[PDB]
């Protein structure tokens, strides 16, 4: 901070792109179709 | 894709043996995981057409990388993650 | 020879004897039928050993298809008496090549499967395996939806 | 040189009219109109002693011109070899045109198809497949012409004449039905094609399905002019299956070549019902009783084993057999083709899964939306 001073960084709204940034991220993370993903008693025997 | 898209790939095959085209979407709407991908091959046809060049669909999937989620995943900030085990699996079922 | 080894199914053992009974008269070279069927004490052992090839190769494919079988049906399928089956049931099971539960009171016998305790694989192969084909529908459906909607 | 075409000027009525232009074609040095007019003379049926005398000058033409594609050079020489009648001295000249002509357009694909065409007198079965396989190796890239692929089917179809894997002929027919869209040949020739095509394709059992593309539009237009009883028994193997009268009908009209495959084709209809009866019905109703197989397939109780277990190796059904009650259990299924009643039968039992699940899925959304919020 001697000989320098920092500067403020704010985001002018890209939200058009930022809205799809959330949609592209979460949809790809939601079971790929939301369908795909949708040790029985034994997983409950390991759970017990 | 208009029919003219056959000539864009064949021109740039000097750069790459097989040029994969990616159809994207600037405005997210429907029905799901967005954009698209095609590959350029020749299957001809069973009916006997002259050799037919038609782009076959390539499954597209989003992926991540280190250090790139810094600013990307920051700006949203409104998402609830996740929660795995209660709401996460059941909302999918309704969908 | 190789026909019985590939795809198996069923054939009358005498028809195999019709083919392998001519090799005695075949020749030119009779030496293949000499070392085998030419010797009386060596042939009778290899004849019953030839039986072990044809009868067990049925048991090998039948163990895959059982489920269950009646004892009387096994006799006409193995082309011999039920008592010869019990002898072929005893000598093959002591080799523990195929697990079998044999009930002689009602005649219902079967090859494996061990009592069906299975739970996970019943539910997993149901939900995981089969529904993967059910959830892959729209995946390649929108792939072909692009195909049909671009031309027509 | 100009005096050579002046003595051959008039071959009869109407011949000189197009030949007066032919002499002005090379003097103007335009080799396209000279290609098409000679090809028009090649297309014009002749003995032909006209194209046989000019083949020496046409050989000299290709020398200094060096450009025009050998495709026109192959089309003229195949009418000339009809006058020569000798495949030996012609193949020496045919390979001569292959080595002397080198261009970006492949001269091997058009020459090798011409070599095997003249090789039918060798007669076959020895050196054929070597020059037959060489075609599609170079033709693999780039098959843009797609017309030479029909010439590739010819010598490939004559390779089948040794009998010769009948099941491969129907697979080789895909290299014909898929070589050119339009027929461009008399349908009466193709109505006797489907004569032996339906037979031979049904004879060889190497192909287990054989009914996939049997509904293709260009072959069924031939099946309209073709003998109707042969098609009605083809629908037995296309859908059928039994239809016991139709599977016998193919043995009524055509006696020969069907004697060895008779009892075999009686086996194919027996494995064709196993997949359909579970496909046609919604089932399950999965496990089947032997008396039902003994009804449809009309087979004795002792032979049901060989029947259904052979289908296990073919791959149309994997279902194990329950031999206590002698009931044959089914797994998976083999779909074949489709029918207008199959789409209507689909919308009945397909959308029924859509309307039943979504109805009770709303019940999952209704009650359980309060505990989520």
């Amino acid at each position: 901070n001697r000989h320098y001073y920092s500067i403020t960084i704010n985001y002018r709204k890209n939200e058009l792109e930022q809205k799809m940034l959330l949609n592209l991220h979460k949809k790809s993370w939601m079971e790929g179709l939301t369908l795909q993903d949708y040790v029985v008693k034994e997983m409950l025997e390991l759970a017990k | 894709l208009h029919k003219n898209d056959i000539a864009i790939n064949e021109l740039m095959k000097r750069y790459c043996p097989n040029s994969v085209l990616v159809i994207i979407d600037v405005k997210p709407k429907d029905l799901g995981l967005p954009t698209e991908a095609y590959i350029s091959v020749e299957e001809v046809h069973d009916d006997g057409t002259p050799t037919s060049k038609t782009f076959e669909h390539v499954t597209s999937e989003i992926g991540a990388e280190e250090a790139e989620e810094v600013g990307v995943e920051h700006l949203l900030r409104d998402i609830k993650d996740t929660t795995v085990g209660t709401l996460s699996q059941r909302i999918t079922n309704q969908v | 020879l190789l026909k019985l080894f590939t795809t198996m199914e069923l054939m009358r053992w005498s028809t195999l004897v019709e083919d392998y009974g001519m090799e005695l008269r075949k020749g030119s070279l009779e030496s293949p039928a000499t070392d085998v069927f030419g010797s009386t004490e060596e042939g009778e052992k290899r004849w019953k050993d030839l039986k072990n090839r044809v009868v067990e190769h049925n048991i090998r494919i039948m163990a895959k298809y059982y489920t269950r079988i009646t004892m009387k049906r096994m006799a006409q399928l193995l082309d011999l008496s039920v008592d010869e089956s019990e002898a072929f049931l005893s000598n093959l099971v002591v080799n523990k090549t195929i697990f079998a539960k044999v009930d002689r009171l009602a005649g219902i016998i079967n090859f494996q499967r061990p009592k069906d305790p299975n739970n996970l694989l019943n539910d997993w192969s149901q939900k995981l395996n089969s529904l993967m084909s059910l959830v892959n529908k729209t995946t390649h459906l929108i792939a072909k939806e692009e195909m049909i909607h671009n031309l027509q | 040189v100009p005096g050579f075409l002046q003595q051959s000027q008039s071959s009869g009525p109407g011949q000189p009219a197009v030949w007066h232009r032919l002499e002005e074609l090379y003097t103007k040095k335009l080799w396209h109109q000279l290609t098409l007019q000679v090809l028009d003379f090649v297309q014009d049926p002749c003995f032909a002693q006209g194209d046989g005398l000019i083949k020496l000058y046409e050989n000299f033409i290709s020398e200094f011109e060096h450009r025009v594609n050998p495709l026109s050079l192959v089309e003229i020489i195949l009418h000339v070899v009809r006058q020569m009648t000798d495949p030996n001295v012609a193949l020496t000249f045919l390979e001569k045109t292959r080595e002397k002509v080198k261009s970006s357009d492949e001269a091997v694909i058009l020459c090798k198809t011409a070599i095997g065409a003249l090789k039918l007198n060798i007669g076959d079965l020895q050196v054929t497949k070597e020059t037959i396989e060489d075609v599609e190796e170079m033709l693999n890239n780039l098959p843009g012409v797609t017309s030479v692929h029909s010439r590739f089917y010819d010598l490939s179809s004559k390779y089948y004449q040794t009998i010769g894997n009948h099941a491969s002929y129907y697979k080789d027919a895909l290299r014909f039905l898929g070589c050119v869209d339009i027929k461009d040949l008399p349908v009466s020739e193709q109505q006797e094609r489907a004569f032996t095509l339906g037979l031979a394709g049904l004879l060889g059992e190497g192909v287990f399905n054989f009914g996939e593309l049997l509904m293709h539009p260009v072959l069924e237009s031939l099946r309209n002019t073709d003998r109707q009883w042969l098609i009605d028994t083809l629908y037995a193997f296309n859908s059928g299956n039994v239809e016991r009268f139709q599977t016998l009908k193919t043995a009524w009209g055509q006696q020969p070549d069907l004697a060895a495959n008779e009892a075999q084709l009686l086996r194919k209809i027996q494995l064709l019902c196993l997949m359909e009866m579970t496909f046609t019905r919604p089932a399950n109703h999965r496990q089947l009783t032997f008396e039902e197989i003994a009804k449809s397939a009309k087979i004795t109780v002792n032979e049901v084993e060989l029947l259904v277990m052979k289908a296990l190796s073919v791959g149309l059904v994997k279902g194990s057999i329950d031999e206590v009650d002698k009931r044959v259990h089914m797994t998976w299924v083999q779909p074949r083709v489709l029918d207008l009643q199959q789409i209507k039968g689909m919308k009945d039992r397909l959308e029924f899964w859509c309307t039943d699940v979504k109805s009770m899925e709303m019940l999952v959304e209704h009650q359980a939306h309060d505990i989520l919020t």
Side-chain angles (χ1 to χ4, degrees):
Chain A
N1 192 29
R2 175 193 59 194
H3 306 164
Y4 286 98
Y5 71 95
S6 186
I7 203 169
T8 68
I9 301 103
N10 68 335
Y11 305 88
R12 62 181 185 90
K13 294 308 292 180
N14 294 123
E15 209 282 334
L16 185 145
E17 178 276 331
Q18 186 56 237
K19 179 182 60 61
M20 73 181 294
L21 186 150
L22 191 149
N23 186 24
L24 271 58
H25 184 273
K26 307 307 175 181
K27 172 57 188 173
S28 180
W29 282 18
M30 195 85 156
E31 324 309 319
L33 229 166
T34 64
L35 276 71
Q36 286 180 336
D37 294 347
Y38 315 98
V39 204
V40 173
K41 305 183 187 303
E42 281 74 8
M43 79 170 290
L44 301 175
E45 290 174 351
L46 297 174
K48 79 189 177 190
Chain B
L1 63 94
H2 46 277
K3 189 179 181 180
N4 182 32
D5 293 344
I6 181 177
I8 287 91
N9 195 326
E10 290 301 311
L11 173 142
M12 68 178 73
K13 294 187 68 63
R14 56 179 177 182
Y15 300 99
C16 183
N18 49 338
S19 300
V20 48
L21 73 89
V22 177
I23 293 180
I24 69 105
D25 192 8
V26 294
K27 301 173 296 298
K29 294 172 297 301
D30 280 325
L31 190 64
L33 190 150
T35 70
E36 205 273 346
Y38 281 116
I39 185 62
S40 178
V41 302
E42 297 81 5
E43 74 283 357
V44 198
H45 201 269
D46 191 17
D47 194 19
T49 70
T51 298
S52 179
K53 194 180 305 295
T54 300
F55 302 98
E56 303 302 324
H57 176 63
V58 170
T59 170
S60 179
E61 64 178 345
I62 312 298
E65 177 68 17
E66 284 299 325
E68 77 174 348
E69 296 181 352
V70 177
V72 171
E73 294 183 350
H74 158 64
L75 293 179
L76 38 97
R77 185 64 68 181
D78 191 74
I79 193 61
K80 175 181 171 60
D81 48 343
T82 302
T83 49
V84 178
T86 157
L87 55 86
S88 181
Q89 68 282 356
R90 54 161 297 180
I91 285 134
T92 64
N93 303 338
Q94 306 180 341
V95 180
Chain C
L1 187 139
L2 184 139
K3 180 180 62 63
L4 184 141
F5 300 148
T6 178
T7 69
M8 198 51 199
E9 309 292 315
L10 295 177
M11 63 178 291
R12 186 65 61 179
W13 184 77
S14 65
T15 60
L16 184 145
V17 181
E18 293 175 352
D19 298 342
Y20 282 143
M22 296 183 293
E23 69 183 348
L24 285 74
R25 186 58 187 87
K26 180 60 167 58
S28 176
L29 50 99
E30 203 265 345
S31 55
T34 299
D35 174 73
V36 180
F37 289 158
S39 298
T40 58
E41 67 282 0
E42 187 70 13
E44 185 70 18
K45 293 179 63 62
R46 296 175 181 182
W47 273 102
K48 300 297 179 62
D49 200 16
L50 168 59
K51 289 296 292 184
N52 189 23
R53 304 297 170 272
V54 297
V55 74
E56 186 183 4
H57 213 288
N58 293 128
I59 303 301
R60 285 190 282 269
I61 69 165
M62 289 176 187
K64 303 180 181 70
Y65 308 150
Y66 301 155
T67 336
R68 286 182 178 85
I69 177 186
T70 42
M71 184 64 187
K72 277 71 180 179
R73 182 174 170 89
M74 174 171 281
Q76 61 180 16
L77 263 57
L78 300 184
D79 299 341
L80 38 81
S81 179
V82 292
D83 191 17
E84 185 68 16
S85 300
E86 286 296 330
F88 284 156
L89 257 48
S90 296
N91 69 343
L92 291 178
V93 79
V94 296
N95 194 27
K96 62 187 177 64
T97 176
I98 284 97
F99 176 79
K101 178 178 293 181
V102 283
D103 178 76
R104 63 168 58 192
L105 67 91
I108 287 93
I109 64 176
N110 63 337
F111 293 163
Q112 296 97 3
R113 59 198 308 267
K115 295 179 180 298
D116 287 331
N118 198 331
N119 46 0
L120 55 102
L121 189 145
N122 298 335
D123 192 11
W124 281 96
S125 66
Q126 196 65 60
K127 298 296 173 291
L128 243 61
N129 198 341
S130 68
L131 276 67
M132 271 182 63
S133 178
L134 311 190
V135 302
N136 280 284
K137 293 293 295 185
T138 310
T139 65
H140 59 263
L141 255 49
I142 65 177
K144 304 182 303 298
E145 189 277 337
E146 291 298 323
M147 306 300 180
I148 59 179
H149 289 82
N150 277 132
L151 43 97
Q152 287 301 323
Chain D
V1 180
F4 174 82
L5 48 81
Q6 292 296 99
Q7 59 183 16
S8 64
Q9 173 181 344
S10 180
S11 297
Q15 192 67 257
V18 283
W19 274 81
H20 303 307
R21 182 179 184 273
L22 194 72
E23 60 175 344
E24 297 299 323
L25 260 33
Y26 75 96
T27 58
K28 270 62 182 177
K29 290 189 64 61
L30 34 90
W31 306 97
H32 278 307
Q33 303 81 353
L34 183 52
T35 294
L36 301 178
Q37 194 67 54
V38 167
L39 180 57
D40 190 17
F41 300 156
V42 167
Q43 182 62 262
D44 176 73
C46 187
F47 296 156
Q49 66 178 20
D51 55 16
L53 293 177
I54 197 64
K55 72 175 295 181
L56 180 63
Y57 182 72
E58 292 297 324
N59 193 342
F60 298 155
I61 279 176
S62 177
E63 292 175 349
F64 59 85
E65 201 279 336
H66 71 72
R67 182 56 191 86
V68 171
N69 212 39
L71 281 174
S72 63
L73 180 61
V74 174
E75 290 167 345
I76 180 175
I77 191 56
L78 63 89
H79 281 77
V80 176
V81 70
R82 186 175 295 274
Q83 179 60 255
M84 300 173 67
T85 66
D86 185 75
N88 293 279
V89 301
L91 283 175
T92 61
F93 178 82
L94 204 159
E95 296 178 354
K96 177 183 177 181
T97 57
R98 178 173 57 85
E99 58 188 343
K100 74 176 182 179
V101 175
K102 45 186 178 64
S103 296
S104 296
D105 295 336
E106 294 300 325
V108 53
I109 52 102
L110 47 86
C111 283
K112 291 296 184 296
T113 52
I115 288 176
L118 275 65
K119 198 173 296 297
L120 268 59
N121 299 334
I122 223 65
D124 272 332
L125 190 63
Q126 43 173 25
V127 77
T128 60
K129 190 177 177 60
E130 287 76 356
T131 184
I132 293 174
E133 186 177 3
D134 185 78
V135 180
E136 81 279 2
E137 288 179 351
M138 298 302 299
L139 182 58
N140 184 27
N141 286 324
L142 179 66
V145 177
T146 317
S147 180
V148 69
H149 193 61
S150 177
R151 301 293 183 185
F152 160 75
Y153 163 77
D154 293 341
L155 41 74
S156 300
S157 60
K158 303 307 291 181
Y159 171 77
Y160 151 78
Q161 298 302 103
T162 60
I163 310 173
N165 193 23
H166 291 288
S168 63
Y169 173 69
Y170 176 78
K171 181 180 295 295
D172 192 13
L174 315 184
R175 300 175 179 87
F176 176 75
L177 189 143
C179 77
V180 63
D181 278 336
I182 40 93
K183 303 177 179 66
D184 71 46
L185 65 95
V187 185
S188 178
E189 197 280 335
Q190 277 178 334
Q191 80 178 25
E192 263 81 11
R193 174 183 178 83
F195 190 98
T196 185
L197 172 61
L199 293 179
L202 187 62
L203 294 175
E205 291 189 352
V207 48
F208 61 95
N209 44 336
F210 173 76
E212 175 185 358
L213 57 97
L214 230 60
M215 205 59 66
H216 199 275
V218 303
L219 63 82
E220 72 183 347
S221 63
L222 317 174
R223 292 197 292 105
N224 295 130
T225 58
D226 187 73
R227 47 178 187 184
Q228 298 303 317
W229 61 267
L230 177 65
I231 283 94
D232 192 13
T233 186
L234 280 174
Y235 289 148
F237 292 89
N238 199 340
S239 298
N241 58 320
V242 43
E243 304 300 323
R244 180 60 60 176
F245 180 76
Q246 285 308 123
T247 187
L248 185 59
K249 280 298 293 182
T250 182
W252 279 88
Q254 194 70 42
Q255 296 303 323
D257 298 340
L258 192 47
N261 294 126
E262 183 173 0
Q264 289 184 338
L265 287 179
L266 297 176
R267 174 68 192 91
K268 283 185 58 184
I269 56 176
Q270 289 179 337
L271 50 83
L272 187 58
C273 63
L274 302 176
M275 43 148 282
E276 277 186 339
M277 59 182 77
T278 176
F279 167 76
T280 302
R281 307 180 308 173
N284 304 272
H285 294 165
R286 212 173 186 87
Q287 185 176 1
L288 303 171
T289 177
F290 63 97
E291 186 176 0
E292 189 275 340
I293 292 99
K295 185 186 300 177
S296 299
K298 61 184 63 181
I299 192 61
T300 181
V301 182
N302 295 281
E303 284 298 326
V304 303
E305 296 78 342
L306 297 80
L307 197 149
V308 297
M309 299 188 301
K310 183 61 177 175
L312 304 176
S313 60
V314 176
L316 59 93
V317 63
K318 290 182 293 293
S320 64
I321 301 96
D322 188 19
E323 297 189 359
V324 47
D325 294 341
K326 300 182 295 183
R327 305 176 184 273
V328 180
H329 176 62
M330 298 280 94
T331 63
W332 187 61
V333 63
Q334 187 64 255
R336 292 302 176 198
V337 207
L338 196 67
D339 283 329
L340 193 146
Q341 62 177 15
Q342 295 296 325
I343 294 113
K344 298 307 292 179
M346 168 189 73
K347 294 185 64 65
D348 292 341
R349 305 185 182 279
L350 197 69
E351 192 274 338
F352 206 68
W353 169 262
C354 174
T355 183
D356 287 341
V357 173
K358 187 176 176 62
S359 60
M360 287 187 179
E361 190 69 22
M362 298 300 297
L363 293 182
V364 178
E365 302 180 359
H366 176 272
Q367 185 61 258
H369 188 275
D370 300 340
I371 51 181
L372 179 142
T373 304

